[PDB]
Nucleic acid binder design. Structure first.
Ligand SMILES: Nc1ncnc2c1ncn2[C@H]1C[C@H](O)[C@]2(COP(=O)(O)OP(=O)(O)OP(=O)(O)O)C[C@H]12
Ligand SMILES: [Ca+2]
Ligand SMILES: [Ca+2]
Ligand SMILES: [Ca+2]
Length: 376
DNA sequence: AGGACCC
DNA sequence: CTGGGTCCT
């Protein structure tokens, strides 16, 4: 049948968490800094020309009065991320995270349950919360219309809760599958919600200007599409399946085409606790065996304070980048799965290092990471 | 172990 | 690019 999906997406996330800590930043352009990047910024700096993922040197010569905060430690943001999922998890248990700031919630059961509570008279008092996409007329007798409006009322109540209990503001889109809920969530930023009625679905899909704007099509799939004469959503909508099935394997073909008409069958799935937790760091140069050992120790110390609570992991992953990537894994010995643990671990990770990197030949690494998969 | 995607 | 994450082959 027809679902009611909501996609929640927080405003200028990292910037936002920074301002909830030091409010003296609120009335002043704020950028969150990572190495030589400005990954995000509040909207005050966004009007002054600063943009997401912009070089700190460009961002200083486009806003030289910009205030920088260091947010390379993802600890505070990650805790907030999960505070948000759990608040959403309370409305309905099935919440899918997508990164730190996005959440899908299948509102179908909630919407159903609400209508059946209503009396065949107050089924016209019903209104919309927030924007309606394309400014479309509501037909109160269209059952799907009535459902999506309800879904927008819930969306507003989530958003209200989030503010009341977490102090956070974000956008929501209500629609009938995840692809559409996510494309409509961004129509009014920041801190607004937009609901998408079925009649306005083609409008939305054909409003996109590059196929890479379709959630599902990324860097590579795009360049393979561009190198085929497909540049618009309609160019791909109307293109031939076979040629495309052939070129991209029946899997991705049939799915990005089906996406291109706004069709998304995919359910919303309980994300739950993570399936992995890692620590990254990047640099200009690391060319010694002693520098590698100490970096891999710090990564593992933060990881350890993290690896407490719940479950415990049964695999270790080591990632390098040299100048894409490379990795070497193996399992964690059983008596080691018992929470000093640092000393055996470093030996393992280094053995995994040597396997990958050759010490007697020159080596230049620009990234290290320590991942724990396989939690039990 | 890598590839592709996501923020 | 950064500091993470997901799933699939
Ligand atoms: N490529 C990237 N590398 C590292 N971090 C990234 C990234 N893209 C996004 N992020 C972070 C920062 C950002 O605050 C974030 C989500 O960003 P995003 O949904 O793209 O938009 P925001 O900057 O949060 O705010 P908004 O959508 O309102 O513009 C949690 C990830
Ligand atoms: Ca977003
Ligand atoms: Ca966001
Ligand atoms: Ca995209």
């Amino acid at each position: 049948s027809s679902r009611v999906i909501v996609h929640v997406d927080l405003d200028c996330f990292y910037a936002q968490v920074e301002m909830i800590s030091n409010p003296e930043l609120k009335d002043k352009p704020l950028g969150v800094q990572q190495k030589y990047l400005v990954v995000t910024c509040n909207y005050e700096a966004r009007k002054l020309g600063v943009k997401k993922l912009m070089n700190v040197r460009d961002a200083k010569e486009k806003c030289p009065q910009l205030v920088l905060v260091n947010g390379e430690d993802l600890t505070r943001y990650r805790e907030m991320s999960y505070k948000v999922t759990e608040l959403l998890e309370e409305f309905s248990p099935v919440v899918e995270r997508l990164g730190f700031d996005e959440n899908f919630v299948d509102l179908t059961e909630m919407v159903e349950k609400r209508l059946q509570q209503l009396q065949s008279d107050e089924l016209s008092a019903v209104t919309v919360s927030g924007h309606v996409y394309n400014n479309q007329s509501i037909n109160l007798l269209d059952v799907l219309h009535i459902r999506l409006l309800v879904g927008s009322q819930i969306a507003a109540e989530m958003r209200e809760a989030m503010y009341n209990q977490l102090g956070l503001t974000g956008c929501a889109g209500v629609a009938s599958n995840k692809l559409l809920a996510k494309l409509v969530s961004g129509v009014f930023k920041p801190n607004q919600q937009t609901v998408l009625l079925p009649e306005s679905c083609q409008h939305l899909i054909h409003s996109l200007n590059h196929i890479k704007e379709i959630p599902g099509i990324g860097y590579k799939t795009a360049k393979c599409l561009e190198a085929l004469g497909i540049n618009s959503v309609r160019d791909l909508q109307t293109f031939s399946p076979k040629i495309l099935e052939k070129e991209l394997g029946i899997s991705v073909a049939q799915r990005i085409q089906k996406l291109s008409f706004g069709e998304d069958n995919s359910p919303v799935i309980l994300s739950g606790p993570p399936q992995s937790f890692s620590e990254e760091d990047s640099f200009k140069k690391c060319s010694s065996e002693v520098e590698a050992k100490n970096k891999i120790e710090e990564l593992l110390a933060s990881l350890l304070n993290r690896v407490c609570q719940d479950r415990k992991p049964h695999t270790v992953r080591l990632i390098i980048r040299r100048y894409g990537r490379e990795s070497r894994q193996c399992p964690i010995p059983s008596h080691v799965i018992q929470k000093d643990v640092m000393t055996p671990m470093v030996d393992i990770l280094m053995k995994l290092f040597r396997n990958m990197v050759n010490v007697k030949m020159p080596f230049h690494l620009t990234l290290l990471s320590v991942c724990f998969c396989n939690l039990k």
